[PDB]
Design a protein around this ligand. Structure first.
Ligand SMILES: *[C@@H]1O[C@H](CO)[C@@H](O)[C@H](O)[C@H]1NC(C)=O
Lengths: 50, 49
C-alpha cells in the first residue's frame, strides 16, 4: 500500500493520479538520481506491532 | 548540536546555491522555493546536520 509521493500534474477535485514515472525536478531531463528527483512511491510499514 | 543559522533581516536567496552543490535529498515539506526573496519572518530555527 504505497502513495504518490510526487507527481508532475496538479490535482483537481474528482481526479485520479495514474502516472508513476520519475518526477522530473530539473530543467534537464531528470531520470532517477542526480537532481532532487526520487521514486514517487514509498512503502508503508503496515505492521501489527506498530 | 545544530548551528543557530538565524536568517533574519536579509533576503533568504539561497536558491542560487542549488547550482553550487548537487543537492540530492531536497525534501521541502511546507514551502519549496526555487527562488526566495520576498517575505520577512521573525524566527527561522535553521539547523545544520
Ligand atoms: C560551495 O561553493 C563551491 C564553489 O566555490 C561549490 O563547488 C560547492 O558545491 C558549494 N557548496 C555549497 C553547499 O554551496
Amino acid at each position: 500500500y504505497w502513495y504518490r509521493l510526487f507527481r508532475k500534474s496538479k490535482l483537481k477535485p474528482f481526479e485520479r493520479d495514474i502516472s508513476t514515472e520519475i518526477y522530473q525536478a530539473g530543467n534537464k531531463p531528470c531520470k532517477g538520481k542526480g537532481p532532487n528527483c526520487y521514486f514517487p512511491l514509498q512503502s508503508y510499514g503496515f505492521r501489527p506491532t506498530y | 548540536a545544530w548551528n543557530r543559522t538565524r536568517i533574519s533581516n536579509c533576503v533568504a536567496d539561497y536558491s542560487v546555491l542549488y547550482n553550487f552543490a548537487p543537492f540530492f535529498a531536497f525534501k521541502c515539506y511546507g514551502v519549496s522555493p526555487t527562488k526566495l526573496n520576498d517575505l520577512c519572518f521573525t524566527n527561522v530555527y535553521a539547523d545544520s546536520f
